Design a protein around this ligand. Structure first.
Ligand code: NI
Length: 200
């Protein structure tokens, strides 16, 4: 996909994997749609086959650190642990290395980011599903606030994401968008480590 011309949107899911991730992957599969999963390293240990699904079925795996700590609260070595422990978990699980990282709570800063070997990927559309856990509100906010180049934040922690996705994909397609991984979204642009990006 050429997102320089084509109207692209990236669906992203934080804080997984968990008990709903496979249903989520099933729904995404049913509508031939890729997504980007910013995974928690602590959770990855328990879900190796599910991470293999992400690779096998066209999705992108990103790092969300290991135990979801605000990285700006940490020391240099603390940040090292969060990055490296998560990478090891992802490599052991799926045989790949993430190429992007999303900082917990969106919290970051130049002095910290310089320690992160990947582009920092934020978002421009917060579905707020972490507060309301409501599938229809997730769809409404994602649909109405998305624009070409948007990155939509959702959470793989709760049933409402599973219930939201079939409708969310349908409506984004009907609204003229092509759904892509974060990699595809930034393909061709200057997408470099230790920098933060919230939109193409
Ligand atoms: Ni998170």
């Amino acid at each position: 996909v050429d997102c320089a011309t084509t109207k692209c949107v990236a669906l992203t899911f934080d804080d997984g994997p968990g008990e709903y991730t496979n249903r989520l992957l099933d729904e995404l599969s049913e509508q031939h749609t890729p997504a980007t999963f910013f995974v928690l390293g602590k959770n990855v240990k328990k879900y190796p086959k599910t991470l293999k699904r992400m690779v096998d079925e066209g999705h992108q795996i990103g790092s969300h650190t290991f135990d979801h700590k605000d990285i700006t609260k940490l020391t240099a070595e603390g940040i090292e642990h969060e990055v490296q422990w998560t990478d090891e978990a992802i490599e052991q699980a799926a045989g790949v290395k993430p190429q992007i990282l999303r900082p917990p709570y969106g919290a970051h800063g130049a002095v910290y980011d310089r320690l992160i070997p990947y582009p920092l990927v934020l978002w421009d559309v917060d579905t707020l599903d972490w507060k309301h856990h409501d599938p229809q509100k997730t769809v409404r906010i994602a649909l109405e606030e998305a624009k070409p180049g948007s990155i939509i934040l959702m959470h793989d922690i709760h049933e409402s994401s599973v219930k939201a996705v079939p409708q969310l994909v349908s409506k984004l397609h009907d609204a003229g968008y092509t759904l892509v991984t974060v990699d595809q979204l930034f393909a061709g642009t200057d997408f470099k480590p230790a920098k933060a990006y919230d939109h193409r």
